[PDB]
Amino acid sequence: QRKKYSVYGSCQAPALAKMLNSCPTFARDWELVEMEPCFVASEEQIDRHLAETIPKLDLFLYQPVSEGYRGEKYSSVFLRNSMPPGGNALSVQYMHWEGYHPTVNSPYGLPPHPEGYVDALIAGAVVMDVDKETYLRHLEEIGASLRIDIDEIESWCVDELKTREVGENDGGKQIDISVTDFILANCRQKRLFYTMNHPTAALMREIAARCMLALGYTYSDISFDQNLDPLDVTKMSLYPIYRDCFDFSELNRMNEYQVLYKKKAYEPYLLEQFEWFERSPKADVSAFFDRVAANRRWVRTALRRAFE
Ligand SMILES: CC(C)(COP(=O)(O)OP(=O)(O)OC[C@H]1O[C@@H](n2cnc3c(N)ncnc32)[C@H](O)[C@@H]1OP(=O)(O)O)[C@@H](O)C(=O)NCCC(=O)NCCS
Ligand SMILES: [Br-]
Ligand SMILES: [Br-]
Ligand SMILES: [Br-]
Ligand SMILES: [Br-]
Ligand SMILES: [Br-]
Ligand SMILES: [Br-]
Ligand SMILES: [Br-]
Ligand SMILES: [Br-]
Ligand SMILES: [Br-]
Ligand SMILES: [Br-]
Ligand SMILES: [Br-]
Ligand SMILES: [Br-]
Ligand SMILES: [Br-]
Ligand SMILES: [Br-]
Ligand SMILES: [Br-]
Ligand SMILES: [Br-]
Ligand SMILES: [Br-]
Ligand SMILES: [Br-]
Ligand SMILES: [Br-]
Ligand SMILES: [Br-]
Ligand SMILES: [Br-]
């Protein structure tokens, strides 16, 4: 009989399960009992898991989910509390990294975007009445400003992760499995994120290996299907000049974007971003830009150096 495990958390949780199941040694030992991610699970589903899934688990692999997110019922502390006596609950870091695409965020406070990501610097430009043609002419100046600020950006990305490692989203329990220092050490040589919250296969393989190491597996047991890339739906493009800090960058101006598995060239993509922001009231676009910018001074700096 294989032991039973579940992986609970963000979109990254099912992806981690896919990756772990692709290792032959791991799949020999473990059977996944699937849990819906924290942003999908219904009340009916989360109640049933506490009663029927969790008490039957040998391993609960989870990302921190605060009580404040959707209530106690969905929280990692509450769920792991229902593990059986001889069970093991291991927390895995929520991966978020804006270092490749420091102008990109999610449009909180604005209509839902069908692609899930918007360019916040474009929001700031729209508020300033910078037209889309001017913005396109200034992509290199924006990228130059970001490149001057690359260490500050990285330092902040690392600090954000380290603070969360303390585990306030998991009742103060320090995160068991993390990759912060790996990300900082490798981010310029290898593409580790397609979007701020979608690790590439390379990063997913590293976090899955660290889970297997935490379970006591020997190095010689650890391998994964290299063809798997679970969070590849949308791929943000790095800005000109800034992209040249990274080893994997090419000799074109800016790579095509991928959104919902479809490619769009950088110019029509950024023109659509302008048009999307222009649909909303300018005051609301401004409130959005101010929220994003408040803890990201490089974004207001780039807008100033390029356009003011
Ligand atoms: C992160 C999440 C799983 C739970 O959040 P939480 O338990 O309340 O605590 P977190 O610190 O993770 O999230 C706090 C906020 O800071 C953001 N954040 C998370 N990690 C971060 C980091 N290292 N640096 C900067 N910002 C970060 C989160 O996106 C979240 O933003 P929001 O409140 O505007 O949604 C979920 O709320 C989330 O942010 N993801 C939404 C996107 C999505 O659907 N992806 C997978 C589903 S969760
Ligand atoms: Br799953
Ligand atoms: Br998946
Ligand atoms: Br799976
Ligand atoms: Br519900
Ligand atoms: Br909590
Ligand atoms: Br526990
Ligand atoms: Br959205
Ligand atoms: Br141009
Ligand atoms: Br977290
Ligand atoms: Br680390
Ligand atoms: Br490392
Ligand atoms: Br790469
Ligand atoms: Br990869
Ligand atoms: Br175990
Ligand atoms: Br050996
Ligand atoms: Br591997
Ligand atoms: Br890519
Ligand atoms: Br690459
Ligand atoms: Br690139
Ligand atoms: Br391209
Ligand atoms: Br409109």
Side-chain angles (χ1 to χ4, degrees), residues 7 13-14 17 32-35:
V7 194
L32 175 65
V33 188
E34 297 157 57
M35 280 181 67

Side-chain angles (χ1 to χ4, degrees), residues 60-236:
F60 188 52
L61 282 174
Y62 69 96
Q63 303 182 299
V65 181
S66 154
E67 192 218 68
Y69 175 59
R70 287 177 67 188
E72 187 183 14
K73 272 187 184 166
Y74 302 92
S75 72
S76 53
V77 287
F78 181 80
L79 292 155
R80 65 189 166 90
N81 178 65
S82 292
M83 280 290 281
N88 188 16
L90 291 172
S91 58
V92 173
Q93 170 176 52
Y94 178 65
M95 288 165 290
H96 182 102
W97 184 268
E98 299 178 21
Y100 298 108
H101 326 107
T103 67
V104 178
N105 214 296
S106 56
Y108 178 113
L110 285 176
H113 195 290
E115 306 164 342
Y117 303 94
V118 297
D119 193 305
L121 193 64
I122 282 181
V126 162
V127 178
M128 286 193 161
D129 296 316
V130 172
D131 72 343
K132 47 193 171 52
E133 304 79 17
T134 304
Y135 189 91
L136 286 171
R137 295 195 281 98
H138 287 68
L139 299 177
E140 289 78 12
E141 290 52 52
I142 289 160
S145 180
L146 298 173
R147 176 162 196 159
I148 290 164
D149 295 334
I150 193 172
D151 287 340
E152 177 175 359
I153 291 163
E154 291 187 358
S155 297
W156 175 84
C157 290
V158 166
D159 289 350
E160 285 299 306
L161 287 178
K162 297 274 195 195
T163 294
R164 282 167 176 86
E165 181 186 26
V166 173
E168 198 167 53
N169 288 329
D170 189 34
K173 175 200 161 170
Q174 181 128 67
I175 277 279
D176 292 309
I177 294 149
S178 58
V179 291
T180 306
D181 298 326
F182 179 92
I183 291 167
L184 180 69
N186 289 274
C187 63
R188 308 229 194 142
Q189 295 78 47
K190 295 165 149 65
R191 193 189 296 272
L192 297 183
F193 285 83
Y194 290 126
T195 74
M196 69 198 169
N197 51 29
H198 288 182
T200 63
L203 188 57
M204 289 306 303
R205 288 190 305 264
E206 180 68 20
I207 187 104
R210 296 188 173 200
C211 291
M212 290 185 64
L213 294 168
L215 298 171
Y217 282 98
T218 179
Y219 71 94
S220 57
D221 280 349
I222 297 168
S223 70
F224 302 109
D225 177 359
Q226 304 297 297
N227 286 80
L228 290 181
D229 199 357
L231 296 175
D232 74 335
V233 50
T234 288
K235 305 184 173 181
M236 289 295 105

Side-chain angles (χ1 to χ4, degrees), residues 274-290:
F274 269 92
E275 294 166 342
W276 187 86
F277 281 118
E278 295 179 21
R279 287 199 269 284
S280 278
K282 182 193 278 189
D284 297 357
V285 178
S286 181
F288 169 68
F289 180 73
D290 288 344

